[PDB]
Design a protein around this ligand. Structure first.
Ligand SMILES: Nc1ncnc2c1ncn2[C@@H]1O[C@H](COP(=O)(O)OP(=O)(O)NP(=O)(O)O)[C@@H](O)[C@H]1O
Ligand SMILES: Nc1ncnc2c1ncn2[C@@H]1O[C@H](COP(=O)(O)OP(=O)(O)NP(=O)(O)O)[C@@H](O)[C@H]1O
Ligand SMILES: Nc1ncnc2c1ncn2[C@@H]1O[C@H](COP(=O)(O)OP(=O)(O)NP(=O)(O)O)[C@@H](O)[C@H]1O
Ligand SMILES: [Mg+2]
Ligand SMILES: [Mg+2]
Ligand SMILES: [Mg+2]
Lengths: 88, 527, 527, 527
């Protein structure tokens, strides 16, 4: 789960054209040096306070996304049989 | 039948071959690097962390990708031959230069000017490396260099530091497989060879099967001794002297052997007979060097002196000699001091002459025989598979430690190349393409430290930026300790590499990669 | 052409190869383990319970899975060479360490630190094993060790216990195939060799074709004897002595043989002639050892003594000698006692010297000839297929019993490794990854007892938990008797293993498995 | 089985083969041309900018396209054999002539008349080239020619200019691989060979292992010297003379060698002995040339003079001689001046005679031994891959510089062919088809300058038009500097190439291309 929670930030950085692991390391360092709200902006390639910059998300979206993703992944991890009709 | 490919297609095949070879080698870089198991046709596989060993086994099905792999293989092979260490670093540097050079060429730059710019940058880098070098002061630097080269093994470093201390500056260290699981150091001093013990009756110490002679004479003679009448006169003079006598000849055969052992058994004389070392031309080479430090004469065939004509005057003087089944050694002799350094000097100038014809390391062996001692480190392990890996590490540390004595030491962990690359910012050229070649070397010089951090689970660029700023905040020697994962003074922490290894690796990598970058077409047979 | 695989794919191929080799071997572990039939190209198949025999024949089509199999094969091969027993246990331990190491590495642990942690744990385990060892007191422990190693065969254990008692501490036990279905023990004492019976007329016991001489003289001489004039003087003075005379020479040829037999037939003297043993250099090695314990002189070529110059003083004295078509043996001689002690002392020190050049077991044979006796156990069975299996078990018990004499005994059934692993809980290291390596060894040390229980139809974990709690409730030596299926004191019950076998198995298994765990890439040829 | 193709189909296959071979070679033309990597079966690939090296490896699967490739390969091979430079230019010219000839033939012209017209045009072009030639004045032109031929390498040009200055006009320059990364020039003067140092006691300078003799005699003799009585009379005379004596013989063996060294050791005489150079017939050839410049007699077998009959009069005189393990050299001698000029004239006249039987360059080596010195340029690089490329460039510049001395220089960069082609406008013939052949050569002569500009990133026709108009506005020598991309006086700028190279390239290209144009049918085996 710890690795999974740090995946979406790397994907956002990779899509914008930056190295995901470098961005993740900088964000982790900025959590102690500056604050928890400090992160990486993808529209412009600089680090800033996301809450102050207005780049915010509802806490319901984050809470539901992680719970739903872990739920479907958990069921598929213990799936033992797949039943499907033979095509044609 | 041949097929020729041009331009981007040719460079694409070369890049794929270089990358595949470099990827396999680069996994062994750093203190936390891992090993590669190489398939052997007959017998057990080989597990090794040695960069050149992995590169020597790499071959590819595609003829054009194989051409790229074979060219980069010469980087590790030449580095191993010259320095004996840093082969993985040289391979990493070669890939970095080639990859950056391809990007510059793809932008339209002239390949020839890029090669010229690369050559200029390396000259500046090598000069900066020499300025950053520090001479080896004593056992502390020797032990630190050996420990680092042995993949942070303090046991190996202590043994090698002891070995160099015993044999001195002119000594020779040899690494051999031990018959047991323990690793031991054996040091012998003096002129010793692999003959002796002609007859079992030549025994003075029955508790050890050792024949020790106190103040013995030696008889240097180049042919077989079998006639009794020619054999008699020497002991006739020797029995008058009363001191022990030792025979060094081609062979003491039949009747001559019979009278020697019987006379010894009666107790009137104390004597022994051994074969002279060498085969073919090694006869003249070895007996002359045996005679020079004993104070006597070789009594060669050229001198035209018969056995009966010899006396006590031309017989050399030795203090102690020990004879066993295989080993005969001499403690000292009457040879003049100024003669041995003349022979030592004669061998050193002959090194350039011998290099054109030699196929054995006997050139260095003769030098250490009369100038000091030779140490044998017997590497032992529970299982042969572990023994091969341990022996390779010891050999790597022995070669690296020797290089450190020659050209000094430098900060380790890739910091030296990072510091040297900082001087490339002030280097300017009138040609834009030659400037691109300088930038290629600057990026390549900082590649090895990033790869070491990557192998240790750290981001290479984050480490590189911190190391760059630590050069101004703290000092030149400050770097990243990938072993535990913090930044500290590398020289004070003992993470150091020889200057020769770093200089050789960068020079070899640029020589091959620069030559490769000028290619436009590849010609190979159709499979 | 080569292909390189990395990371999880590389470890997956290695694990498959190790598992497939270990699965075949592990079916033979324990008293209720079963046998494996191995195909032979020519002749009948081989049925064996020997672990190293099964492992030596294993090979796989996949090049990368073969590399894993070949590496683990060295665990059984080295264990067999050093200890001669416990090869199946070593293979089981090697698989357990590798399987647990892969799980730890998959969690992100550093392979190098895991290997370092494994090395530290084994040192603690070996030290704990030595503390748990018990010296062999007498025949009871010898018989118990032989019985267990022979797969609970009391008949084999009784024979081997008798064999050790007869030959003493310095004796040598040899195993050979019998010509009949019965198994017999043959013991000979004295210096005996494979020559004799030059002529049929040298007979003193026509009821056995045995030539027995009472208080005979022996003539040690290294060359052929054919001249009559040189041959006469040795009988010219022994006929004055009147005692029987025995000739040991390179050959007694023609006229010299003719006068010897004819003179013997007339009854004036009692004599026999035999060939000297050995070939090549073995002449000097054997005749010297023959002469040392007889009180005479070897009369070698170096001594320069002719046949006519010999006398009774240099001829050795013996009590009895027996001569037949193949065997010639001496009961005793006039050799001084301290002389044979030195010869025995000279040989054991020569063991280290000759180990670098020997290819035959004559090193121990020469020692046993003048220090005691040699025993030949002739294994017999109704059919050759059963004979091969029975002979393998006897050889296994002979090697195990010898190891028990050297380093003592230990509780059997895998209890010793379980007790040793209990000491690993108190071992702590500063590195988290090195701690994982310690936990790997602790789990591996308890694997063999689980496998033994599994082969016996019991649950391994249920047995292991009971054995662990019995260590505190009852004692260290308490364990599980897989033969009948209850818990008892293994040492009192006679289920004991040599300390050397257990120590070697764990050391060899960790040395190989730890080395493989540091691999990251595999290089092999494309088929 | 054979298949025959005719007409357009035959020419289409030939054109494809010629074009494919020419395309690979032409990428190396010009100062900004790039290199080609050639696959080698065993070992590292070869990177080269040499045109004939690339062409020699080209082969094709199609039998008819291979015939076109093989025919054009002879253009580069012949140019390399005769001139040693300009192989790429010759290949470019050959493709241009063949391509233009095919277009003319496709219009219905007679192939035979086209070949005749081509032959007439080349004669005019060669005559115009000779008129445009300029003799070499001194070191400036020599250095400029060497620098251009070495791909604009000033370091190589300086060394070769120094080498020519030291050895003079009659000297011989040899290129060898250096054992280190540095490039050095070694020059020796006088008659020297590869023998010497029969015994270690022939030492006069222990600090350099060199036997130097001041005003010594030499002994030229053709057989072994082993008899003592025949050797003494020559020393009985020179010991009267008192000067050092040197032995040149087939061998000085055993007793004869023994008395020579012992006499020298005692200090009464100073002497040395060396072997005669060569093998087989080379002994007669070399000893006579050794004796001619020393003022003595060869004392050959034909003269019928025994060893005892020799005296001081027939023994030659020398100033200094130096003897080491491999090299023996003489500084001067007493030979008459007019004799060696006869010998060099004889050898030069024997060049035509020797060319029909020789297989070694010893014909020129003997010339430089008695008329000047021989220089050895040891090319060195960090890695063998760069060494091979650097050595090829040095050899190319050495051959080009020698050609410049012979037939002078001419403007480089293809300007000379452009200026020569301008004279073809005034050439007229009565046959229309022969006129087409003249136009073919005119277009072909201007091809190389366009290809050089194309390799430099410039349009070939734009450069050619400017160069053509610069001939009238500025002068004949004005051309395009492809190195930096501007127009300047080629001769003043130092961009020059030998007249011989240009003359040979155009002649060889037209000879093969003209012959190929007359083909109508191709016969080849069915694969
Ligand atoms: N504890 C450490 N921390 C950081 N860098 C280290 C440490 N130990 C060694 N190094 C560096 O790692 C490199 C040595 O690793 P190694 O795998 O021997 O490379 P190599 O010498 O190029 N290969 P080989 O020829 O196989 O010895 C050098 O640059 C050392 O300075
Ligand atoms: N009756 C028994 N009850 C429990 N354990 C036993 C019993 N007999 C033997 N053992 C144990 O089983 C093991 C011996 O079985 P064996 O099949 O010889 O293993 P190995 O020695 O590793 N293989 P090999 O080299 O083929 O003899 C030892 O650990 C013994 O202590
Ligand atoms: N700086 C320059 N500018 C213009 N032309 C040049 C320059 N340097 C050399 N050249 C010309 O380029 C040609 C030499 O290039 P090169 O690649 O050696 O051709 P080649 O001699 O036909 N081939 P090779 O046999 O491999 O030496 C000659 O015509 C030179 O005059
Ligand atoms: Mg190293
Ligand atoms: Mg067993
Ligand atoms: Mg050229």
């Amino acid at each position: 789960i710890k690795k999974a929670c740090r995946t979406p930030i790397r994907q956002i950085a990779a899509n914008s054209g930056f190295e995901g692991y470098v961005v993740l390391e900088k964000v982790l360092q900025l959590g102690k040096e500056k604050g928890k709200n400090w992160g990486f902006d993808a529209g412009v390639g600089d680090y800033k306070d996301m809450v102050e910059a207005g780049i915010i998300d509802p806490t319901k979206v984050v809470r539901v996304a992680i719970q739903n993703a872990a739920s479907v992944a958990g069921t598929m991890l213990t799936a033992e049989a797949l039943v499907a009709e033979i095509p044609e | 039948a041949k097929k020729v490919i041009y331009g981007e297609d040719a460079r694409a095949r070369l890049k794929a071959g270089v990358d595949k070879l470099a990827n396999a080698v680069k996994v062994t870089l750093g203190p936390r690097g891992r090993e590669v198991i190489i398939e052997k046709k007959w017998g057990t596989p080989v597990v090794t962390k040695d960069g050149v060993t992995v590169a020597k086994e790499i071959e590819f099905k595609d003829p054009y990708e194989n051409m790229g792999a074979q060219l980069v293989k010469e980087v590790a092979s030449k580095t191993s031959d010259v320095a004996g260490d840093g082969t993985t670093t040289a391979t990493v540097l070669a890939q970095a230069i080639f990859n950056e050079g391809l990007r510059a060429i793809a932008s339209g730059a002239n390949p020839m000017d890029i090669k010229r710019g690369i050559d200029k940058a390396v000259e500046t880098v090598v000069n900066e490396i020499k300025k950053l070098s520090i001479p080896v002061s004593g056992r502390k630097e020797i032990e630190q260099v050996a420990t680092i080269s042995a993949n942070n093994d303090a046991t190996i470093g202590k043994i090698i530091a002891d070995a160099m201390e015993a044999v001195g500056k002119d000594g020779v260290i040899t690494v051999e497989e031990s018959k047991s699981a323990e690793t031991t150091l054996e040091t012998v001093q003096g002129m010793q060879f692999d003959r002796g013990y002609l007859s079992p009756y030549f025994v003075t110490n029955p508790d050890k099967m050792e024949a020790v002679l106190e103040d013995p004479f030696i008889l240097i003679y180049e042919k077989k001794i079998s006639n009794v009448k020619d054999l008699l006169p020497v002991l006739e003079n020797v029995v008058r002297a009363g001191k022990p006598l030792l025979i060094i000849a081609e062979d003491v055969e039949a009747e001559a052997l019979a009278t020697l052992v019987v006379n010894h058994i009666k107790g009137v004389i104390r004597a022994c007979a051994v074969k002279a070392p060498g085969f073919g031309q090694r006869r003249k080479d070895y007996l002359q060097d045996i005679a020079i430090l004993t104070g006597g004469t070789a009594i060669t065939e050229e001198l035209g002196i018969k056995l009966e004509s010899v006396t006590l005057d031309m017989l050399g003087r030795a203090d102690k000699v020990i004879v066993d089944k295989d080993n005969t050694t001499i403690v000292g002799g009457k040879g003049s001091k100024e003669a041995i350094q003349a022979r030592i000097e004669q061998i050193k100038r002959q090194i350039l002459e011998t290099t054109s014809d030699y196929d054995r390391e006997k050139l260095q062996e003769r030098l250490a025989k009369l100038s000091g001692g030779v140490a044998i480190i017997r590497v032992g392990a529970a299982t042969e598979a572990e023994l091969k890996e341990k022996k390779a590490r010891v050999e790597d540390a022995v070669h690296a430690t020797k290089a450190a004595v020659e050209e000094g030491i430098v900060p380790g962990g890739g910091v030296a190349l990072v510091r040297a690359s900082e001087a490339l910012d002030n280097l300017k050229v009138d040609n834009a393409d030659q400037q691109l070649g300088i930038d290629i070397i600057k990026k390549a010089c900082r590649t090895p430290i990033r790869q070491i951090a990557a192998n240790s689970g750290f981001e290479g660029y984050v480490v590189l930026e911190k190391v760059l700023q630590l050069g101004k905040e703290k000092g030149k020697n400050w770097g990243f300790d990938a072993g535990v994962g913090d930044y500290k003074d590398m020289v004070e922490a003992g993470i150091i590499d020889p200057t020769k290894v770093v200089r050789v690796a960068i020079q070899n990598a640029a020589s091959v990669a620069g030559t490769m970058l000028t290619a436009e077409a590849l010609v190979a047979e159709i499979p």
